[PDB]
Design a protein around this ligand. Structure first.
Ligand SMILES: Cc1ccccc1CSc1nncn1N
Length: 190
């Protein structure tokens, strides 16, 4: 009969946000190019996310809160729109937190991406296109609605907000995530 405290481990939003399509549970993690905590979470969240059933869907959304925040995230959405899969996405975080070659401009981004199999022309073509902007505004209005006041931040079904600090550790974050998945799943368990 329960095992977590509201506000202590996970915080429930007074104003919840509905997902686009029902049936599957929404799991969003708002990472940033300036959060070290997100880097140490990668080798821990991957084995969990890539082992989830066909009832849970993880989404990669950056902390687009204007300023330099949105700038340090658009690059990711650009790659996802390129149609590349299993292109060693983790290598990107490496050049950001291990090297930190000031990836704040498209030039530096393309220069680095070109070394892993990325066309500078395609990149810049869609980068400066509305195709990415439509995604940017989409995540922007959702991020602030998910009550994301920090990074990282795991949001489940736009109702429960938690993170490493709130949970009490990277492992505790996974505990809360799995618990909340069943929490929402129970509201529609046939
Ligand atoms: C918000 C966006 C931008 C880019 C890729 C995927 C998405 C859809 S993810 C989403 N849409 N409504 C709720 N939710 N978490």
């Amino acid at each position: 009969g329960d095992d977590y405290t509201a506000g202590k481990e996970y915080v429930e939003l007074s104003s919840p946000v509905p997902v686009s399509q029902p049936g599957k549970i929404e799991v969003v993690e708002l990472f940033w190019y300036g959060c070290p905590h997100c880097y140490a979470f990668e080798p821990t969240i991957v084995p969990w996310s890539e082992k989830l059933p066909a009832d849970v869907h993880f989404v990669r959304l950056p902390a687009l809160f204007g300023g330099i925040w949105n700038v340090h995230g658009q690059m990711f959405l650009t790659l996802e729109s390129m149609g590349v899969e299993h292109d060693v996405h983790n290598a990107v975080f490496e050049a950001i937190h291990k090297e930190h070659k000031k990836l704040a401009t498209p030039e530096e981004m393309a220069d680095f991406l070109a070394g892993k199999g990325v066309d500078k022309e395609k990149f810049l073509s869609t980068y400066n296109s509305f195709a990415i902007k439509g995604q940017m505004e989409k995540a922007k209005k959702l991020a602030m609605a998910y009550q994301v006041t920090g990074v990282p931040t795991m949001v489940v079904n736009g109702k429960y907000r938690f993170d490493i600090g709130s949970a009490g550790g990277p492992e505790e974050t996974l505990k809360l995530a799995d618990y909340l998945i069943e929490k929402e799943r129970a509201a529609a368990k046939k």
